[model samples]
Target: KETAAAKFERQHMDSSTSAASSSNYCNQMMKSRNLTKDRCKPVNTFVHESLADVQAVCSQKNVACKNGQTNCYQSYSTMSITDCRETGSSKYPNCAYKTTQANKHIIVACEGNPYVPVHFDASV
Candidate 1:
């Protein structure tokens, strides 16, 4: 019974962290957040912003999603984020990752009663 919004938060939200520059960031976050359960996630991102700020993105002006959905919205301001990419030699359950930090506009898909973010589309 996990709402899409909740799952998105679990995977992407990391408001309290400031260690994005650490080499082991992805290696630690990917596992700690349950992203490396059965198979390694090729790539993922963590937004170093507050939940309220992220949820507000859903109310921003709509834009086309990568998959052609019009329910997506892009952040009006750039936000701090960390990208985690699995290394080639990494395997499932032992996933290794490289972290890249950036400040970019986040794009996400929104839905439901409160219209919160359901999917993280991309960062631009």
Candidate 2:
């Protein structure tokens, strides 16, 4: 029988399969926000990576052993919601309240992998 933590790890691992598709959700959110090139440019947001990469790092630490050792697994859920505000730029004095937005609700998953640096899951 699987322990509760094992079960949780399994669930988390399963959920990561959807990680690749996470970008689609972010695009939808951007559409909903009516974000356009005219509104704002992409800012330096958090970086994300694949579960395979995450697992690789975990393996190095023996946290996710290949022997079914049931050490631990990492997972995450995140969403990026942005709010636009008008701010003046010194370079563009005529620019009226340029829309400036920042990313929020970024989730990071760092379970079982010390070598795998912390990364933004998305923006939720």
Candidate 3:
């Protein structure tokens, strides 16, 4: 079994790819990182900062989810992040993704007694 913290790190953190070259970053990463197993898990985010910096986002701004969800927060300071979206030609085992990196305020949904990020909602 995997802990929430490690799972978060696996699903979101990629220290090697803190920076990327072209659109193929996500395509290679999403597959090599084993995200396309069982089904094509399309969208994802990779934050290029210390876990502490990312965790400190909870204290930034308390705001409502873009959706009708309950608890979430957004950071005031913009940071480096990568957004990965599946390409139209995406197939299950052979899925593809586009890479887009930028600096923006990140919003995340967190939970539990430890209260860590479970979802990278959006960049606002």
Candidate 4:
């Protein structure tokens, strides 16, 4: 699994460096838009799982368990999430995701279980 920094590096350092390499490209576009840098801080989204693995785990959990009274359950656990931001200077502009910047936090509840681990992006 790739850390948020790793993802940021990978996205910014790809052979196509025109956009990612731009100074403040991420900070300006993603950060300025109110995205959280904390998403990338977690070395792993979950204590024992990678982001992809965590997503898979969440999906499995959702399937194995029934949805609580609410469409979703609320718990202390967390999960890493990604978001897209627009960068171009236009009414409708091009959007890019801050892959390196894990900006979203997800609270997951499986059948109202409290033991489920809280996962975050924690890339920084």
lDDT of 2 by residue, 55-101 (tens): 45333322333334444333332322332223344122222222223
In order, candidate lDDTs are: 0.91, 0.33, 0.79, 0.32
TM-scores of all models? 0.96, 0.19, 0.85, 0.24
Badly placed stretches (over 4 Å) of model 1 are none
Error of 1 at 123 (Å): 0.3
Backbone collision count in every prediction? 0, 5, 0, 14
Give the 10-residue window scoring lowest on summed lDDT in candidate 2. Answer: 90-99
Q: For candidate 3, lDDT tens digit of each residue in 5-89?
A: 6777778877664576787888877776778888888798888777887777766787778786866789888878888988889
What does candidate 3 score on TM? Answer: 0.85
Indicate the residue-level lDDT of 92 in model 3: 81
Worst 10 residues of 4 by lDDT: 40-49
lDDT of 4 by residue, 26-103 (tens): 444444433334342112221222434333333432311133332222223443333234334312123333333242
Which wins on TM-score, candidate 3 or candidate 4? 3
In angstroms, the error of model 1 at 109 is 0.3
Q: Which is the better candidate, 1 or 3, if ranked by lDDT?
A: 1
Candidate 2 Cα misplacement greater than 4 A, ranges: 1-43, 46-100, 111-117
Better of 1 and 4 by TM-score: 1
| CA deviation > 4 Å runs, candidate 3 | none
**Number of the top TM-score candidate:** 1
